Amino acid sequence: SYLAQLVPRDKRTLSNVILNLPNHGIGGIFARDTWHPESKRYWEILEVVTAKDSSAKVDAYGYLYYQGEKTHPFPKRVHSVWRYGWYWKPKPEQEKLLQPLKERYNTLVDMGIIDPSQL
Amino acid sequence: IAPSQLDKLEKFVHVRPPKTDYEEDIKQAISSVTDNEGLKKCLDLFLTNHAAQTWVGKHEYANAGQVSDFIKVCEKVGSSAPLVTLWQSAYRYGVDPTVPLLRSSAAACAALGEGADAALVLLYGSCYIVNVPEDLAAAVRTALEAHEKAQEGNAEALAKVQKYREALDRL
Amino acid sequence: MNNLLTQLPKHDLLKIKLVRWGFNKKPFYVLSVMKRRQARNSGNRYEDIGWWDPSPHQDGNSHFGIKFDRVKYWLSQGAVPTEKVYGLFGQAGIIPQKPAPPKYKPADGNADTKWRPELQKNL
Amino acid sequence: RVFTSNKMDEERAKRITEQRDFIQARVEWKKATISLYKEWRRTFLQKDIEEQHTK
RNA sequence: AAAGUGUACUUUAUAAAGUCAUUGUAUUGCUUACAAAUAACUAGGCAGUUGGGUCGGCUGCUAUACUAUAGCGCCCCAAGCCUGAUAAUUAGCUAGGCGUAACAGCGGCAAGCCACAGUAGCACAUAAAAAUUGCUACCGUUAACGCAGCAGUAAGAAAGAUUGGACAAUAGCUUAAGGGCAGAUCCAGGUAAGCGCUAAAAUCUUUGUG
Ligand SMILES: [K+]
Ligand SMILES: [Mg+2]
Ligand SMILES: [Mg+2]
Ligand SMILES: [Mg+2]
Ligand SMILES: [Mg+2]
Ligand SMILES: [Mg+2]
Ligand SMILES: [Mg+2]
Ligand SMILES: [Mg+2]
């Protein structure tokens, strides 16, 4: 489920996060678990293209923000897609709308119906 | 290798583009499928179609028209697992979660008699739709009761039904 | 015989190095300007600039000699001292001391006996 | 090689702080030595020019 | 250049930096002369051989010097070039070193240069490079191997050491997360160059006892 992309997981590349999101996660905010939560480090996705052969990997383009400021002049592809630890950071408006849905997902995981490790 | 700059992406796409149009293949596949294995192939076809559209530049729900046909084939075949997987990863397959689709899947599972599967579909659907219809909930409850009566002899089935009933009541 | 080199290397670096000229467990060193990739005691040099006696004497000090004028000349040309030569120059006040990186490895518990089997025979 | 950790604990903070100090110290050391070499380089060049004129 | 540059890569609630790619005023040099063992029971040697002219002699991207190593190669032209030449025997050279009042004579140690890696012909490799890189033929053992790397074994010879420990120090390779690798090297074992000391006790050394 797309709600499972909020919590970082081991061996979870950005490609899995991007693919399992509405509209391929265009215009979303993503960051790795090794980055400090208060450092304001994240990627903003502007364009996504799937792999020619595999069709399970994605080349993403966007902007890189450090301390809420751009680090480069023009959009560039994400060179660290293949690394692990990526997770989804919904915007405040999305967080408010997804409040009840997150509670439902957490309850299902707690009861054991949904296994986040498998997904 | 993909270009570093976004301004050079258009040239990269135009060179040796992969096959993108799979509507004809999917339509033929849906009709020809009569077993669970064919249903799995259709799911792979949906995934490839949803991923392939990005090369043209579309980011919409490509697999929005054949969802109903796939449900009908699954109900006739009698396997509900493909539908359970689809709802679990609805976005990944390019299917937009909607109430009419949830009702159709629940009715198909209820007709098959798998109340436990009906509860699973409803529970997964509740993670995409904020408000679940009360009439649909009653239908699933009836399906669970029918499932329990049909498979009352299996203790494991009874435990699964009880667990799903608690989940529906809690959520 | 041992004419000093005049042409500078074209594909390697010049360094200021310590040359072992001691006896059995009685080290003594000479500082010279030599090509980076050579034998330790090779006869190819540009100049000999100093000497060092690392062991203490009756006065409790170590003794070090160096050409002050020529050290500056070779440092200007591009000669790169080794780690130990930096320590000698830093303490002698020719150039500022070079900071060292932090260390985490548990230090060796047998440094003066691990490589001397004669002591281990008695141990 | 670089050190990264998903756990925001004291160990991670210590490694970052120590690395910053070492890099800052080394950068300052490099500037001082180069300035001395440049100053000495000018002095020897001037001496050679004087010697050439005398010859 | 112990440098600059980057729509590049990595680390940061702590940041300075490094990594990768690329850049030099002509963009990595040729030639000549002198010295160095025997040797005439080696007297003739050379025909691309000596010289001249056209052409070729590549890996670009300041301007001139009327083309600015070369029989180095093709074609053409003129007959010249060497003559203790040509052919043989022996040896790595310099030098430390040993004898001698010196002159001379001979060639164990530290280091510099050159050549080679079973034999020969080639490809890379230009500028600092082929023991531990390839292709082919051949020789010796058994499609493979060649210890003139350290230790070690067999035969030969009057006569040639352990199948040892350690990267702690010096030098080197890699790496900004402070590490990894190493028969160079440092130590030990073995062998009557050489140098030093011990092989007997003494108020339990009056540098004592207290
Ligand atoms: K040869
Ligand atoms: Mg010989
Ligand atoms: Mg050969
Ligand atoms: Mg070599
Ligand atoms: Mg041999
Ligand atoms: Mg040997
Ligand atoms: Mg070192
Ligand atoms: Mg004897």
XYZ file of C-alpha atoms (C1' of nucleotides) and ligand atoms in Angstrom:
686
model
C 0.000 0.000 0.000
C 1.099 3.579 -0.655
C 0.714 4.300 3.072
C 3.654 1.949 3.718
C 6.039 4.429 2.053
C 5.893 6.830 5.019
C 8.149 4.689 7.247
C 11.617 3.982 5.782
C 12.425 0.307 5.279
C 15.616 -1.635 4.649
C 16.501 -2.363 1.013
C 13.765 0.018 -0.180
C 15.072 2.000 -3.139
C 13.474 5.244 -4.279
C 12.120 3.439 -7.348
C 9.749 1.367 -5.211
C 8.615 4.499 -3.365
C 7.981 6.463 -6.562
C 6.188 3.661 -8.415
C 3.759 2.842 -5.582
C 2.294 6.342 -5.362
C -0.516 8.156 -7.197
C 0.561 9.961 -10.370
C 4.028 8.432 -9.849
C 4.644 10.823 -6.957
C 5.155 13.866 -9.178
C 5.456 16.997 -7.065
C 6.124 15.024 -3.884
C 8.721 15.347 -1.132
C 11.145 12.504 -0.401
C 14.197 12.090 1.818
C 16.438 9.388 3.252
C 16.457 8.102 6.821
C 20.133 8.994 7.328
C 19.309 12.696 6.923
C 18.413 14.524 10.114
C 14.660 15.266 10.305
C 15.266 18.936 11.171
C 17.925 19.486 8.483
C 15.253 20.295 5.855
C 16.880 18.008 3.276
C 14.516 16.616 0.651
C 13.916 16.148 -3.069
C 11.034 17.634 -5.066
C 10.091 15.424 -8.016
C 9.233 17.138 -11.309
C 9.565 14.398 -13.949
C 9.719 10.595 -13.928
C 10.685 8.148 -16.687
C 10.702 4.373 -16.273
C 13.541 2.092 -17.322
C 13.474 1.042 -20.965
C 13.897 -2.688 -20.258
C 13.251 -3.484 -16.589
C 10.078 -1.366 -16.298
C 10.564 -1.620 -12.513
C 13.138 1.180 -12.097
C 12.676 4.914 -12.600
C 14.895 7.872 -13.474
C 13.650 10.922 -11.571
C 14.372 14.629 -12.013
C 13.840 17.503 -9.615
C 15.437 19.966 -7.213
C 17.563 19.401 -4.110
C 16.918 21.518 -1.009
C 19.250 21.985 1.960
C 17.959 24.138 4.824
C 15.030 25.057 2.596
C 17.152 26.491 -0.224
C 18.101 25.292 -3.692
C 21.603 23.864 -4.092
C 21.846 23.839 -7.912
C 20.601 26.177 -10.660
C 18.729 23.750 -12.931
C 16.852 20.461 -12.468
C 18.992 17.326 -12.435
C 18.415 13.600 -12.177
C 18.653 11.832 -8.822
C 21.972 9.966 -8.789
C 21.272 8.232 -5.445
C 18.119 6.399 -6.549
C 19.792 3.004 -6.128
C 20.541 3.634 -2.436
C 18.308 2.572 0.453
C 16.394 4.435 3.139
C 14.046 6.616 1.086
C 10.627 7.465 2.503
C 7.642 9.638 1.623
C 7.046 13.022 3.296
C 3.466 14.185 2.629
C 2.768 17.904 2.713
C 0.680 19.349 5.571
C -2.477 19.391 3.441
C -1.991 15.732 2.518
C -1.245 14.842 6.143
C -4.550 16.325 7.313
C -6.514 14.511 4.602
C -4.725 11.208 5.296
C -5.201 11.315 9.088
C -7.970 8.673 9.287
C -6.364 6.522 6.585
C -3.068 6.345 8.482
C -4.940 5.254 11.612
C -6.697 2.498 9.660
C -3.408 1.293 8.171
C -1.692 1.304 11.567
C -4.539 -0.693 13.114
C -4.350 -3.306 10.351
C -0.580 -3.617 10.787
C -0.966 -3.891 14.565
C -3.529 -6.682 14.164
C -1.184 -8.423 11.709
C -3.396 -8.274 8.614
C -0.815 -6.178 6.726
C 2.905 -6.990 6.832
C 4.971 -3.874 5.988
C 8.120 -5.948 5.437
C 6.578 -7.870 2.534
C 5.240 -4.693 0.903
C 22.348 5.929 -19.614
C 19.792 8.640 -18.912
C 20.961 12.236 -19.451
C 21.909 14.291 -16.417
C 20.120 17.476 -17.483
C 16.356 17.665 -17.869
C 16.717 19.830 -20.988
C 18.249 16.828 -22.801
C 15.547 14.338 -21.782
C 13.397 14.867 -24.885
C 16.148 13.635 -27.210
C 16.742 10.594 -24.997
C 13.072 9.577 -25.113
C 12.722 9.843 -28.895
C 15.651 7.488 -29.576
C 14.576 3.830 -29.702
C 11.332 4.300 -27.735
C 9.892 1.140 -26.166
C 6.500 -0.256 -27.078
C 3.810 1.792 -25.330
C 0.390 0.813 -26.719
C -0.832 -2.374 -25.018
C -4.603 -1.830 -25.227
C -5.021 -4.374 -28.029
C -2.894 -6.971 -26.233
C -4.797 -6.511 -22.967
C -8.199 -6.789 -24.657
C -7.204 -10.053 -26.338
C -5.597 -11.343 -23.135
C -8.693 -10.681 -21.016
C -10.934 -12.685 -23.351
C -8.469 -15.571 -23.702
C -7.850 -15.946 -19.950
C -9.731 -18.817 -18.307
C -7.464 -19.715 -15.361
C -5.601 -18.134 -12.464
C -2.321 -18.173 -14.397
C -3.857 -16.046 -17.141
C -5.128 -13.623 -14.506
C -1.580 -13.186 -13.200
C -0.417 -12.477 -16.754
C -3.094 -9.788 -17.074
C -1.848 -8.178 -13.859
C 1.660 -8.092 -15.327
C 0.214 -6.589 -18.512
C -1.440 -3.858 -16.441
C 1.852 -3.127 -14.677
C 3.777 -2.908 -17.953
C 1.139 -0.648 -19.509
C 1.119 1.683 -16.500
C 4.921 1.908 -16.540
C 5.207 2.223 -20.326
C 3.002 5.322 -20.597
C 5.695 7.472 -18.960
C 7.794 7.364 -22.136
C 5.045 9.143 -24.070
C 4.650 11.527 -21.116
C 1.243 10.501 -19.730
C 0.854 10.142 -15.958
C -2.853 9.262 -15.789
C -4.599 6.009 -14.847
C -4.100 4.111 -18.094
C -5.779 0.939 -16.782
C -9.101 2.612 -15.993
C -11.363 0.997 -18.604
C -10.491 -2.702 -18.473
C -10.770 -2.957 -14.674
C -14.434 -3.962 -14.911
C -13.678 -6.647 -17.503
C -10.886 -8.072 -15.344
C -13.273 -8.323 -12.386
C -15.816 -10.197 -14.509
C -13.199 -12.702 -15.688
C -11.984 -13.277 -12.128
C -15.517 -13.917 -10.862
C -16.223 -16.382 -13.677
C -12.901 -18.161 -13.122
C -13.516 -18.256 -9.362
C -10.172 -16.901 -8.104
C -10.309 -13.818 -5.874
C -6.597 -13.530 -5.045
C -5.838 -11.406 -8.158
C -8.441 -8.860 -7.049
C -7.069 -8.826 -3.497
C -3.595 -8.074 -4.854
C -4.965 -5.350 -7.135
C -6.614 -3.468 -4.266
C -3.493 -3.863 -2.122
C -1.431 -2.145 -4.856
C -4.145 -0.268 -6.737
C -1.949 2.731 -7.564
C 0.948 0.589 -8.794
C -1.330 -1.035 -11.395
C -2.741 2.284 -12.617
C -6.219 1.634 -11.186
C -7.975 4.569 -9.543
C -9.685 3.387 -6.324
C -13.387 4.236 -6.411
C -16.526 3.143 -4.582
C -18.147 1.459 -7.634
C -15.038 -0.677 -8.144
C -14.975 -1.661 -4.467
C -18.649 -2.650 -4.584
C -18.128 -4.740 -7.724
C -15.159 -6.595 -6.228
C -16.986 -7.206 -2.945
C -20.046 -8.510 -4.793
C -17.878 -10.836 -6.887
C -16.149 -12.222 -3.793
C -19.480 -12.492 -1.971
C -20.956 -14.422 -4.900
C -18.001 -16.819 -4.785
C -18.742 -17.276 -1.072
C -15.327 -16.148 0.222
C -16.489 -13.874 3.012
C -12.926 -13.688 4.315
C -11.767 -12.340 0.951
C -14.684 -9.896 0.982
C -13.507 -8.582 4.352
C -9.955 -8.251 3.022
C -11.108 -6.266 -0.014
C -13.248 -4.005 2.172
C -10.395 -3.508 4.645
C -7.921 -2.687 1.874
C -10.509 -0.451 0.222
C -11.011 1.459 3.470
C -7.396 2.635 3.120
C -8.267 4.400 -0.163
C -11.830 5.639 0.493
C -12.450 7.774 3.576
C -16.097 6.696 3.928
C -17.181 3.094 3.316
C -20.900 2.615 2.531
C -22.873 1.027 5.351
C -24.822 -1.192 2.947
C -21.542 -2.603 1.635
C -20.470 -3.350 5.209
C -23.713 -5.246 5.820
C -23.158 -7.246 2.629
C -19.667 -8.241 3.781
C -21.039 -9.219 7.195
C -23.549 -11.515 5.490
C -20.740 -12.967 3.371
C -18.703 -13.683 6.506
C -21.683 -15.432 8.104
C -22.195 -17.539 4.977
C -18.468 -18.305 4.846
C -18.432 -19.327 8.513
C -21.383 -21.682 8.021
C -19.876 -23.193 4.868
C -16.448 -23.795 6.454
C -17.465 -24.146 10.106
C -15.559 -27.442 10.272
C -12.141 -25.801 9.862
C -10.885 -24.190 13.069
C -8.380 -22.074 11.132
C -11.184 -20.687 8.965
C -13.184 -19.826 12.087
C -10.213 -17.965 13.571
C -9.649 -16.035 10.337
C -13.327 -15.067 10.142
C -13.302 -13.947 13.778
C -10.138 -11.899 13.241
C -11.586 -10.178 10.169
C -14.870 -9.505 11.976
C -12.956 -7.786 14.780
C -11.015 -5.714 12.243
C -14.223 -4.608 10.519
C -15.816 -3.717 13.860
C -12.744 -1.788 15.021
C -12.368 0.101 11.730
C 81.662 9.457 -7.774
C 78.316 10.328 -6.183
C 77.587 13.389 -8.291
C 74.359 15.056 -7.210
C 71.437 15.151 -9.619
C 70.620 18.451 -11.323
C 67.571 17.803 -13.519
C 64.262 17.637 -11.690
C 61.981 14.598 -12.062
C 59.331 14.787 -14.774
C 56.965 12.011 -13.630
C 57.508 11.778 -9.847
C 57.689 13.945 -6.724
C 60.656 15.133 -4.682
C 60.614 14.354 -0.968
C 62.716 14.934 2.137
C 63.352 11.510 3.634
C 65.135 9.769 6.502
C 67.916 7.324 5.585
C 68.779 4.563 8.057
C 72.501 4.711 8.913
C 72.613 3.090 12.351
C 73.718 -0.230 13.818
C 71.940 -3.171 15.430
C 69.351 -1.471 17.668
C 71.346 1.785 17.387
C 69.463 3.843 14.789
C 70.908 6.962 13.182
C 69.349 8.984 10.372
C 70.426 11.360 7.608
C 68.034 13.753 5.865
C 68.358 14.090 2.095
C 66.367 15.215 -0.940
C 65.506 12.156 -3.031
C 62.999 10.938 -5.591
C 59.799 9.562 -4.089
C 59.995 6.101 -5.698
C 63.460 4.619 -5.128
C 65.371 2.354 -2.788
C 65.663 3.617 0.777
C 69.473 3.900 0.733
C 69.907 4.707 -2.957
C 72.900 6.824 -3.898
C 70.813 9.152 -6.083
C 70.325 12.429 -4.206
C 70.055 16.153 -4.811
C 71.554 17.201 -1.460
C 72.120 16.074 2.139
C 70.583 18.568 4.548
C 70.840 17.191 8.089
C 71.108 14.349 10.572
C 69.221 13.062 13.602
C 70.092 10.917 16.631
C 66.807 9.656 18.137
C 68.234 8.145 21.316
C 68.740 10.118 24.545
C 72.190 10.996 25.863
C 73.495 11.683 29.369
C 71.825 15.108 29.174
C 68.439 13.503 28.479
C 68.012 15.183 25.084
C 68.046 14.152 21.441
C 70.299 15.949 18.972
C 69.312 17.261 15.545
C 71.264 19.181 12.913
C 69.894 20.889 9.822
C 70.812 23.476 7.191
C 68.415 26.354 7.828
C 69.038 28.128 4.516
C 68.833 25.050 2.279
C 65.716 23.635 3.961
C 63.793 26.746 2.922
C 65.150 26.505 -0.628
C 63.955 22.933 -1.172
C 60.594 23.520 0.516
C 60.064 26.405 -1.908
C 60.949 24.264 -4.930
C 58.320 21.674 -4.009
C 60.003 19.014 -1.891
C 57.417 17.334 0.347
C 58.631 16.133 3.774
C 57.484 12.782 5.101
C 55.397 12.439 8.259
C 58.386 12.080 10.588
C 60.244 14.970 8.954
C 57.184 17.154 9.546
C 57.424 16.297 13.238
C 61.095 17.258 13.387
C 60.497 20.514 11.507
C 57.462 21.329 13.643
C 59.291 20.915 16.945
C 62.369 22.744 15.636
C 60.119 25.663 14.671
C 60.951 25.738 10.962
C 57.273 25.375 9.981
C 53.997 25.120 11.907
C 53.055 21.742 13.339
C 50.867 19.544 11.138
C 47.669 18.298 12.838
C 47.052 14.560 13.052
C 43.716 12.776 12.505
C 41.754 11.196 15.362
C 42.570 7.597 16.255
C 40.060 4.911 17.247
C 41.919 1.609 16.854
C 42.907 0.005 20.183
C 46.641 0.599 20.344
C 49.058 -2.326 20.240
C 49.740 -3.988 23.582
C 52.994 -5.595 22.399
C 54.992 -3.061 20.376
C 58.556 -3.526 21.676
C 58.356 -7.324 22.120
C 56.091 -8.550 19.303
C 58.884 -8.217 16.719
C 61.793 -9.343 18.956
C 61.792 -13.149 19.344
C 64.705 -12.982 21.798
C 62.491 -11.383 24.449
C 59.614 -13.760 23.693
C 61.922 -16.713 24.366
C 62.432 -15.421 27.908
C 58.727 -14.569 28.262
C 34.855 6.024 2.789
C 32.319 7.972 4.861
C 30.356 7.346 8.051
C 26.553 7.437 7.981
C 24.024 6.142 10.495
C 20.238 5.992 10.665
C 20.332 6.352 14.471
C 20.494 9.971 15.664
C 22.458 9.224 18.830
C 25.554 10.535 20.600
C 27.903 8.392 18.507
C 26.744 10.005 15.261
C 27.122 13.506 16.705
C 30.652 12.811 17.949
C 31.878 11.582 14.559
C 30.561 14.662 12.746
C 32.055 17.077 15.283
C 35.484 15.427 15.235
C 35.601 15.403 11.432
C 34.771 19.116 11.262
C 37.608 20.074 13.613
C 40.210 17.989 11.776
C 39.297 19.437 8.376
C 39.287 23.005 9.705
C 42.706 22.571 11.320
C 44.238 21.085 8.170
C 42.876 23.853 5.930
C 44.391 26.565 8.127
C 47.725 24.734 8.243
C 47.902 24.528 4.447
C 47.482 28.285 3.976
C 50.262 29.212 6.406
C 52.883 26.940 4.838
C 52.133 28.035 1.266
C 52.526 31.714 2.152
C 55.941 31.008 3.679
C 57.041 29.093 0.579
C 55.910 31.921 -1.703
C 57.815 34.500 0.354
C 60.998 32.416 0.267
C 60.557 31.784 -3.460
C 60.685 35.505 -4.260
C 63.847 35.984 -2.193
C 65.833 33.294 -4.011
C 64.639 34.474 -7.428
C 65.908 37.984 -6.689
C 69.311 36.628 -5.645
C 69.687 34.729 -8.923
C 68.883 37.865 -10.931
C 71.572 39.793 -9.056
C 74.110 37.007 -9.611
C 73.350 36.806 -13.336
C 73.871 40.553 -13.743
C 77.229 40.366 -11.960
C 78.445 37.563 -14.233
C 49.917 22.904 -11.738
C 51.559 22.872 -3.208
C 46.933 25.763 -9.352
C 42.255 27.183 -11.994
C 37.509 25.671 -14.112
C 32.340 22.365 -13.670
C 23.924 22.586 -15.114
C 29.111 16.563 -12.367
C 29.593 13.005 -7.408
C 29.767 12.467 -1.681
C 29.265 14.280 3.426
C 26.481 18.499 6.793
C 19.694 20.458 12.692
C 27.501 20.821 13.252
C 30.880 22.570 6.458
C 35.200 23.335 5.993
C 36.370 20.135 2.129
C 37.603 16.210 -0.878
C 36.361 12.799 -5.146
C 35.734 12.434 -10.730
C 36.441 14.999 -15.515
C 39.338 18.707 -18.049
C 43.201 22.703 -18.905
C 50.403 24.686 -19.686
C 54.116 29.820 -24.924
C 54.936 26.581 -28.647
C 53.103 21.123 -24.935
C 58.125 14.566 -22.961
C 65.481 15.958 -27.915
C 68.630 14.921 -31.056
C 73.777 15.282 -32.757
C 79.175 15.448 -32.690
C 84.442 14.883 -30.547
C 88.291 12.214 -27.325
C 89.811 7.951 -24.133
C 89.379 2.605 -22.745
C 92.418 -5.844 -23.545
C 95.063 -9.231 -26.699
C 95.616 -9.360 -31.936
C 99.739 -9.726 -38.813
C 100.954 -17.739 -38.545
C 94.207 -12.163 -39.587
C 96.095 -7.991 -45.981
C 92.988 -6.543 -48.371
C 87.578 -4.552 -47.020
C 82.883 -2.188 -48.985
C 78.386 -1.774 -54.141
C 73.215 1.058 -50.184
C 78.702 0.560 -50.166
C 80.799 6.932 -50.306
C 78.385 11.503 -51.951
C 74.343 14.582 -54.685
C 68.762 15.659 -56.421
C 62.973 14.707 -56.159
C 59.468 12.120 -52.924
C 58.117 9.786 -48.112
C 59.150 10.041 -42.936
C 51.347 10.731 -39.624
C 48.988 11.492 -34.593
C 46.771 18.593 -35.954
C 44.760 23.937 -33.756
C 51.522 31.454 -32.578
C 54.453 33.932 -36.634
C 59.221 33.674 -39.638
C 63.767 31.102 -40.826
C 62.664 28.678 -48.921
C 61.571 22.791 -45.153
C 65.355 23.581 -40.354
C 69.184 15.235 -37.337
C 70.321 11.255 -40.745
C 71.057 6.167 -46.960
C 66.343 6.098 -42.032
C 63.145 4.163 -46.923
C 61.809 4.392 -52.796
C 63.491 6.302 -57.682
C 67.429 8.698 -60.424
C 72.578 10.516 -60.980
C 78.254 10.646 -60.091
C 82.351 6.774 -58.636
C 83.769 7.294 -54.546
C 84.693 5.521 -49.053
C 88.156 2.561 -45.439
C 93.154 0.511 -45.175
C 96.759 -1.741 -38.462
C 90.924 -1.765 -42.333
C 88.302 -6.405 -42.279
C 87.966 -11.135 -39.536
C 88.977 -13.527 -34.858
C 90.122 -14.557 -29.009
C 88.717 -12.869 -24.168
C 85.691 -9.667 -20.706
C 79.662 -6.526 -18.241
C 81.732 -0.977 -17.445
C 82.795 2.902 -13.577
C 84.518 2.603 -8.721
C 85.095 1.355 -3.535
C 88.768 -2.484 -2.505
C 94.017 -5.656 -1.816
C 99.824 -5.520 -2.391
C 103.679 -1.407 -3.287
C 108.117 4.351 -0.809
C 106.001 5.438 -5.448
C 105.267 4.097 -10.574
C 102.769 -0.087 -11.919
C 99.741 -4.713 -11.150
C 95.108 -7.415 -9.898
C 89.480 -7.133 -9.483
C 85.141 -10.376 -2.744
C 81.757 -5.944 0.342
C 78.337 0.151 -0.156
C 76.515 2.742 -4.538
C 75.762 4.505 -10.032
C 74.933 3.011 -15.429
C 73.891 -0.931 -19.072
C 71.889 -6.045 -20.503
C 68.806 -10.146 -19.474
C 64.425 -13.515 -17.151
C 64.639 -21.713 -20.799
C 66.092 -20.203 -26.734
C 64.498 -17.040 -31.016
C 61.124 -13.696 -33.924
C 57.080 -10.196 -32.970
C 52.548 -6.992 -30.719
C 51.629 -3.378 -26.939
C 55.008 0.314 -24.202
C 55.776 6.814 -26.726
C 58.086 9.753 -22.157
C 59.588 6.856 -16.292
C 57.774 0.042 -17.699
C 57.468 -6.010 -18.903
C 60.508 -12.105 -13.633
C 55.305 -12.408 -11.511
C 51.658 -9.254 -19.715
C 50.280 -11.470 -24.607
C 51.072 -14.123 -30.067
C 54.219 -17.761 -32.885
C 58.130 -21.517 -33.490
C 61.678 -24.421 -30.946
C 64.315 -27.256 -26.428
C 63.583 -30.078 -21.717
C 59.921 -32.513 -18.305
C 54.735 -33.784 -18.037
C 46.631 -29.425 -22.594
C 50.398 -27.301 -18.961
C 55.303 -25.719 -16.465
C 60.576 -23.077 -16.813
C 62.594 -20.115 -8.676
C 69.066 -16.003 -12.209
C 62.064 -13.195 -6.274
C 62.484 -15.407 -0.049
C 62.981 -20.142 2.376
C 63.856 -25.059 0.591
C 65.187 -29.940 -2.444
C 68.365 -33.068 -5.990
C 72.867 -33.578 -8.808
C 77.709 -31.526 -9.659
C 82.059 -29.378 -6.767
C 87.936 -29.231 -2.358
C 84.252 -25.690 -0.639
C 77.578 -22.613 -0.853
C 72.870 -20.714 5.883
C 66.305 -21.439 8.599
C 61.048 -24.654 4.177
C 61.998 -18.631 11.312
C 59.157 -13.817 13.723
C 57.026 -8.935 12.805
C 54.858 -4.808 10.122
C 56.788 -1.828 16.265
C 60.621 1.663 13.284
C 62.591 3.659 8.126
C 60.927 3.874 2.721
C 56.761 2.585 -0.671
C 51.210 1.423 -2.797
C 45.953 2.661 -1.862
C 42.320 5.711 1.019
C 39.913 12.498 3.548
C 35.816 8.863 8.292
C 42.350 7.391 10.115
C 42.142 1.852 7.876
C 44.176 -2.090 4.502
C 48.656 -4.609 1.771
C 53.933 -6.118 1.761
C 59.897 -12.548 1.953
C 61.814 -4.323 0.583
C 63.185 -3.668 5.444
C 63.789 -4.325 10.716
C 64.894 -8.703 14.387
C 66.095 -13.936 15.481
C 68.654 -19.039 13.807
C 73.351 -21.186 11.377
C 78.881 -20.824 9.791
C 86.486 -20.267 14.717
C 87.141 -13.020 9.176
C 87.550 -9.117 12.781
C 86.687 -6.118 17.650
C 85.328 -6.192 23.290
C 84.536 -8.901 27.866
C 84.018 -13.301 31.303
C 85.794 -18.457 32.756
C 88.508 -17.869 41.798
C 87.214 -16.472 46.612
C 88.502 -12.464 49.926
C 86.023 -8.142 56.376
C 78.965 -9.786 51.745
C 84.176 -4.115 47.325
C 84.746 1.930 53.822
C 81.158 4.323 46.635
C 80.276 0.124 53.125
C 77.888 -0.236 58.033
C 75.195 3.008 61.076
K 67.190 -12.309 -25.167
Mg 80.681 -13.142 -20.216
Mg 63.426 -13.780 -24.672
Mg 59.970 -2.453 -13.345
Mg 65.797 -21.338 -14.351
Mg 66.250 -18.762 -4.766
Mg 53.658 5.038 5.656
Mg 90.393 -24.005 9.528
